[PDB]
Design a protein around this motif. Structure first.
Motif, PDB file in Angstrom:
ATOM      1  N   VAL A  48     -10.510   1.745   1.308  1.00  0.00           N
ATOM      2  CA  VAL A  48     -11.724   0.937   1.415  1.00  0.00           C
ATOM      3  C   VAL A  48     -11.716   0.192   2.727  1.00  0.00           C
ATOM      4  CG1 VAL A  48     -13.183  -0.957   0.469  1.00  0.00           C
ATOM      5  CG2 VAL A  48     -11.982   0.685  -1.064  1.00  0.00           C
ATOM      6  N   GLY A  49     -12.589   0.560   3.681  1.00  0.00           N
ATOM      7  CA  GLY A  49     -12.534  -0.206   4.924  1.00  0.00           C
ATOM      8  C   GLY A  49     -13.149   0.504   6.062  1.00  0.00           C
ATOM      9  N   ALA A  50     -12.467   0.517   7.223  1.00  0.00           N
ATOM     10  CA  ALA A  50     -12.919   1.257   8.373  1.00  0.00           C
ATOM     11  C   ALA A  50     -12.048   2.446   8.660  1.00  0.00           C
ATOM     12  CB  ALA A  50     -13.016   0.353   9.625  1.00  0.00           C
ATOM     13  N   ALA A  66     -11.424   6.575   7.937  1.00  0.00           N
ATOM     14  CA  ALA A  66     -11.895   7.784   7.283  1.00  0.00           C
ATOM     15  C   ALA A  66     -11.662   7.620   5.808  1.00  0.00           C
ATOM     16  CB  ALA A  66     -11.186   9.056   7.806  1.00  0.00           C
TER      17      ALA A  66
END
Lengths: 16, 16
Positions: free
Chosen positions: B1-3, B5
């Motif tokens: 969950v985040g930046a 891929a």
């Protein structure tokens, strides 16, 4: 997979 | 969950 929260670089699992 | 891929902001699923 990446930065942020979850698995990778940043917070959560993997590398801090 | 985040930046990066996977799911979130960046590439893969969610917001590009």
């Amino acid at each position: 997979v990446g930065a942020x929260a979850x698995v990778x670089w940043x917070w959560x699992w993997x590398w801090x």
